[PDB]
Design a protein around this motif. Structure first.
Motif, PDB file in Angstrom:
ATOM      1  N   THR A  63      -2.264   0.863  -3.543  1.00 35.47           N
ATOM      2  CA  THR A  63      -1.908  -0.145  -2.548  1.00 35.47           C
ATOM      3  C   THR A  63      -0.469   0.029  -2.069  1.00 35.47           C
ATOM      4  O   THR A  63      -0.199  -0.004  -0.863  1.00 35.47           O
ATOM      5  CB  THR A  63      -2.119  -1.544  -3.131  1.00 35.47           C
ATOM      6  OG1 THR A  63      -3.489  -1.695  -3.526  1.00 35.47           O
ATOM      7  CG2 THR A  63      -1.776  -2.620  -2.109  1.00 35.47           C
ATOM      8  N   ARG A  64       0.469   0.247  -2.997  1.00 37.17           N
ATOM      9  CA  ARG A  64       1.853   0.434  -2.573  1.00 37.17           C
ATOM     10  C   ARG A  64       2.071   1.793  -1.914  1.00 37.17           C
ATOM     11  O   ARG A  64       2.976   1.923  -1.085  1.00 37.17           O
ATOM     12  CB  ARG A  64       2.816   0.221  -3.752  1.00 37.17           C
ATOM     13  CG  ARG A  64       2.774   1.229  -4.900  1.00 37.17           C
ATOM     14  CD  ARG A  64       3.908   2.249  -4.804  1.00 37.17           C
ATOM     15  NE  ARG A  64       3.964   3.131  -5.965  1.00 37.17           N
ATOM     16  CZ  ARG A  64       4.710   2.898  -7.040  1.00 37.17           C
ATOM     17  NH1 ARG A  64       5.466   1.809  -7.104  1.00 37.17           N
ATOM     18  NH2 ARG A  64       4.702   3.755  -8.052  1.00 37.17           N
ATOM     19  N   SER A  65       1.242   2.795  -2.230  1.00 37.82           N
ATOM     20  CA  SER A  65       1.345   4.071  -1.526  1.00 37.82           C
ATOM     21  C   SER A  65       0.807   3.967  -0.105  1.00 37.82           C
ATOM     22  O   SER A  65       1.395   4.526   0.828  1.00 37.82           O
ATOM     23  CB  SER A  65       0.601   5.163  -2.291  1.00 37.82           C
ATOM     24  OG  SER A  65      -0.797   4.938  -2.266  1.00 37.82           O
ATOM     25  N   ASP A  68       3.366   1.938   1.793  1.00 38.91           N
ATOM     26  CA  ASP A  68       4.746   2.404   1.766  1.00 38.91           C
ATOM     27  C   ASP A  68       5.207   2.793   3.167  1.00 38.91           C
ATOM     28  O   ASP A  68       6.117   2.166   3.718  1.00 38.91           O
ATOM     29  CB  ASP A  68       4.885   3.589   0.803  1.00 38.91           C
ATOM     30  CG  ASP A  68       6.333   3.897   0.440  1.00 38.91           C
ATOM     31  OD1 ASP A  68       7.249   3.188   0.907  1.00 38.91           O
ATOM     32  OD2 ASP A  68       6.554   4.860  -0.325  1.00 38.91           O
ATOM     33  N   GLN A  69       4.593   3.821   3.753  1.00 41.88           N
ATOM     34  CA  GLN A  69       4.947   4.202   5.116  1.00 41.88           C
ATOM     35  C   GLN A  69       3.892   3.745   6.114  1.00 41.88           C
ATOM     36  O   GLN A  69       4.197   2.985   7.040  1.00 41.88           O
ATOM     37  CB  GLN A  69       5.141   5.719   5.223  1.00 41.88           C
ATOM     38  CG  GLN A  69       6.338   6.275   4.462  1.00 41.88           C
ATOM     39  CD  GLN A  69       6.027   6.574   3.007  1.00 41.88           C
ATOM     40  OE1 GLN A  69       4.864   6.670   2.616  1.00 41.88           O
ATOM     41  NE2 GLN A  69       7.069   6.726   2.198  1.00 41.88           N
ATOM     42  N   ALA A  70       2.666   4.270   5.961  1.00 35.29           N
ATOM     43  CA  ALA A  70       1.433   3.913   6.672  1.00 35.29           C
ATOM     44  C   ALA A  70       1.427   4.230   8.168  1.00 35.29           C
ATOM     45  O   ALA A  70       0.378   4.124   8.813  1.00 35.29           O
ATOM     46  CB  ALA A  70       1.098   2.428   6.474  1.00 35.29           C
ATOM     47  N   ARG A  74       8.446   1.881   9.731  1.00 37.08           N
ATOM     48  CA  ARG A  74       8.514   1.207   8.442  1.00 37.08           C
ATOM     49  C   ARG A  74       8.069  -0.240   8.614  1.00 37.08           C
ATOM     50  O   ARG A  74       8.683  -0.996   9.375  1.00 37.08           O
ATOM     51  CB  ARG A  74       9.936   1.279   7.865  1.00 37.08           C
ATOM     52  CG  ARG A  74      10.065   0.916   6.384  1.00 37.08           C
ATOM     53  CD  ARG A  74      10.499  -0.528   6.144  1.00 37.08           C
ATOM     54  NE  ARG A  74      10.730  -0.793   4.726  1.00 37.08           N
ATOM     55  CZ  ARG A  74       9.778  -1.125   3.859  1.00 37.08           C
ATOM     56  NH1 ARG A  74       8.518  -1.237   4.259  1.00 37.08           N
ATOM     57  NH2 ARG A  74      10.085  -1.347   2.588  1.00 37.08           N
ATOM     58  N   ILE A  75       7.006  -0.616   7.912  1.00 34.74           N
ATOM     59  CA  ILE A  75       6.453  -1.963   7.947  1.00 34.74           C
ATOM     60  C   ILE A  75       6.403  -2.478   6.512  1.00 34.74           C
ATOM     61  O   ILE A  75       5.942  -1.756   5.627  1.00 34.74           O
ATOM     62  CB  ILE A  75       5.052  -2.009   8.584  1.00 34.74           C
ATOM     63  CG1 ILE A  75       5.102  -1.509  10.028  1.00 34.74           C
ATOM     64  CG2 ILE A  75       4.476  -3.417   8.561  1.00 34.74           C
ATOM     65  CD1 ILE A  75       5.975  -2.355  10.933  1.00 34.74           C
ATOM     66  N   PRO A  76       6.885  -3.691   6.236  1.00 37.86           N
ATOM     67  CA  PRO A  76       6.871  -4.204   4.859  1.00 37.86           C
ATOM     68  C   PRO A  76       5.468  -4.518   4.359  1.00 37.86           C
ATOM     69  O   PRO A  76       4.484  -4.500   5.103  1.00 37.86           O
ATOM     70  CB  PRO A  76       7.718  -5.479   4.950  1.00 37.86           C
ATOM     71  CG  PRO A  76       8.565  -5.285   6.159  1.00 37.86           C
ATOM     72  CD  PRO A  76       7.706  -4.531   7.122  1.00 37.86           C
ATOM     73  N   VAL A  77       5.397  -4.826   3.061  1.00 34.97           N
ATOM     74  CA  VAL A  77       4.113  -4.993   2.386  1.00 34.97           C
ATOM     75  C   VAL A  77       3.465  -6.321   2.774  1.00 34.97           C
ATOM     76  O   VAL A  77       2.245  -6.395   2.979  1.00 34.97           O
ATOM     77  CB  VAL A  77       4.310  -4.869   0.862  1.00 34.97           C
ATOM     78  CG1 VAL A  77       2.996  -5.050   0.111  1.00 34.97           C
ATOM     79  CG2 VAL A  77       4.945  -3.529   0.519  1.00 34.97           C
ATOM     80  N   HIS A  78       4.271  -7.383   2.894  1.00 32.82           N
ATOM     81  CA  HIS A  78       3.739  -8.697   3.247  1.00 32.82           C
ATOM     82  C   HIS A  78       3.207  -8.720   4.675  1.00 32.82           C
ATOM     83  O   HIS A  78       2.230  -9.420   4.969  1.00 32.82           O
ATOM     84  CB  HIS A  78       4.814  -9.767   3.058  1.00 32.82           C
ATOM     85  CG  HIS A  78       5.243  -9.951   1.636  1.00 32.82           C
ATOM     86  ND1 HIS A  78       4.472 -10.614   0.706  1.00 32.82           N
ATOM     87  CD2 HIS A  78       6.366  -9.562   0.985  1.00 32.82           C
ATOM     88  CE1 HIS A  78       5.099 -10.623  -0.456  1.00 32.82           C
ATOM     89  NE2 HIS A  78       6.250  -9.992  -0.315  1.00 32.82           N
ATOM     90  N   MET A  79       3.824  -7.942   5.571  1.00 33.69           N
ATOM     91  CA  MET A  79       3.319  -7.833   6.935  1.00 33.69           C
ATOM     92  C   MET A  79       1.967  -7.128   6.969  1.00 33.69           C
ATOM     93  O   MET A  79       1.067  -7.551   7.702  1.00 33.69           O
ATOM     94  CB  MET A  79       4.333  -7.102   7.815  1.00 33.69           C
ATOM     95  CG  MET A  79       5.526  -7.944   8.263  1.00 33.69           C
ATOM     96  SD  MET A  79       6.607  -8.484   6.920  1.00 33.69           S
ATOM     97  CE  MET A  79       6.185 -10.221   6.794  1.00 33.69           C
TER      98      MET A  79
END
Length: 79
Positions: A63-65, A68-70, A74-79
DNA sequence: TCTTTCTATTATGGTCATGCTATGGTACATACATTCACAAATGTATGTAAACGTAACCTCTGTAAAGTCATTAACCTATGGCACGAAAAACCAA
């Protein structure tokens, strides 16, 4: 001896999380890192199997991978 | 000791240029602090008065140089008077 006997659990749980977000070899490597982090904090007195405890850690790693970039930005995890 | 039958990269142009743009999803719960956005006060800021001095500046009387006009006499057309040189009459020589 733990990692050489449990790389295949990592690849079995990692080949079902390949929904075209990024190339899957990084997902294999992050699953190996999550396997290491699950082995580093494994208990014996619980009496349960290691796969159920390691599944949450390796899904957190994937999930964090994938968050991370996606993108190219750069977009944060909560977004 | 030596030539053929296979296992893999280069290669052939662009000029004249075209329209309408995305394609499937897969978890939350504490956490502690960096950052944006407003209250309120400082500090130097700008724009309104007031004083001195000379940028001067026209007005008027005195000194000086330049056009003109009083003298006075130098020359110059006149007048009268006396030589002067031409033109005609006269007389002598051949």
């Amino acid at each position: 001896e733990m990692v050489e006997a449990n790389l295949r659990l990592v690849i079995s749980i990692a080949k079902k999380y390949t929904n075209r977000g990024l190339q899957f070899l990084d997902l294999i490597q992050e699953g190996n890192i999550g396997l290491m982090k699950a082995v580093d904090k494994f208990e014996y007195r619980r009496g349960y199997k290691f796969s159920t405890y390691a599944t949450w850690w390796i899904r957190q790693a994937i999930t964090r991978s994938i968050a991370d970039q996606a993108r190219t930005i750069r977009i944060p995890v909560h977004m």
